[PDB]
Amino acid sequence: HHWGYGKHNGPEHWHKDFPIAKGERQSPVDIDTHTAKYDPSLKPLSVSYDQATSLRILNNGHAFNVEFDDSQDKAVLKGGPLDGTYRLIQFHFHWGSLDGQGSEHTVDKKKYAAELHLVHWNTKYGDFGKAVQQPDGLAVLGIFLKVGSAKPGLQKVVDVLDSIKTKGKSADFTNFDPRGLLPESLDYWTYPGSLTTPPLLECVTWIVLKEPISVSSEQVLKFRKLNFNGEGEPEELMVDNWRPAQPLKNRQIKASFK
Numbered sequence: 001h002h003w004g005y006g007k008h009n010g011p012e013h014w015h016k017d018f019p020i021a022k023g024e025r026q027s028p029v030d031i032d033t034h035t036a037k038y039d040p041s042l043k044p045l046s047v048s049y050d051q052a053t054s055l056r057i058l059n060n061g062h063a064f065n066v067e068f069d070d071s072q073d074k075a076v077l078k079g080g081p082l083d084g085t086y087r088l089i090q091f092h093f094h095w096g097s098l099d100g101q102g103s104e105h106t107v108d109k110k111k112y113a114a115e116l117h118l119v120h121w122n123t124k125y126g127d128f129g130k131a132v133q134q135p136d137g138l139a140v141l142g143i144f145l146k147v148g149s150a151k152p153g154l155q156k157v158v159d160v161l162d163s164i165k166t167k168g169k170s171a172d173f174t175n176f177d178p179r180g181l182l183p184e185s186l187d188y189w190t191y192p193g194s195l196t197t198p199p200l201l202e203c204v205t206w207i208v209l210k211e212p213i214s215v216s217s218e219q220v221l222k223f224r225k226l227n228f229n230g231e232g233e234p235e236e237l238m239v240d241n242w243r244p245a246q247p248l249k250n251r252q253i254k255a256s257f258k
């Protein structure tokens with residue numbers, strides 16, 4: 001009876017195995033755009049994905065991860081609200097059963113169709129497993145997806161999905177360039193939060209871009225064909241793999257703009 005996204009093991013139950021689910025800096029949150037403070041001291045984000053080595057794509061039974069070789073100083077996030085340098089380890093998405101839901105963060109209560117998370121760990125802690133035990137361990141760049149025109153830089157991801165339908169399937173996935181998943185603007189909101197999945201560790205500086213990317217209905221439909229179950233088990237489509245907004249509690253969301 002492990003955690004997941006259903007009635008009996010979804011978000012509302014996670015607190016029994018992971019009590020920090022009711023902690024002081026949980027994610028996601030609603031971003032009230034009127035209440036976010038513009039911080040002129042925030043720096044442009046620096047996203048340096050020129051040498052990113054993707055390696056493989058994995059279906060883990062919760063989402064899928066596009067993984068990067070993070071054994072060298074390639075694919076780094078820095079600047080923004082960050083001190084130091086964060087290295088890209090993986091990205092994944094959360095999405096809905098319907099286009100009117102799927103994001104984890106919301107913007108004045110608006111829910112997007114999906115949300116991409118590019119996960120980076122702070123090099124000062126040497127690896128991802130040590131970084132998640134620190135309050136400044138991770139920086140996640142979150143990008144909303146709305147349904148409209150296709151994102152051409154997303155199609156390679158879409159096209160490999162039929163090879164990783166079920167939990168525990170992986171496929172070789174090299175030369176994937178995550179710059180093709182990025183909006184023109186890098187204006188952002190930022191706040192201190194947590195992993196949105198168990199173990200819900202309070203180790204993330206969230207950086208949510210204001211400009212969504214558009215993807216086509218046919219691209220998101222292919223996300224909804226994945227399965228949460230493993231091969232040979234009854235089919236449970238992988239949809240609605242999002243945690244709802246959590247209380248903001250004693251936190252301030254900062255805007256890099258306007």
Ligand SMILES: Cc1cc(C)nc(SCC(=O)c2ccc(Cl)c(S(N)(=O)=O)c2)n1
Nearest residue numbers: 062117119138140194195196197198199
């Ligand atoms: C840490 C961890 C360990 C195991 C066994 N599974 C997962 S599934 C979700 C995931 O890979 C993950 C990893 C790190 C981040 Cl930061 C986030 S999220 N949804 O907060 O961006 C999600 N996560």
Ligand SMILES: [Zn+2]
Nearest residue numbers: 093094117196
């Ligand atoms: Zn995520």
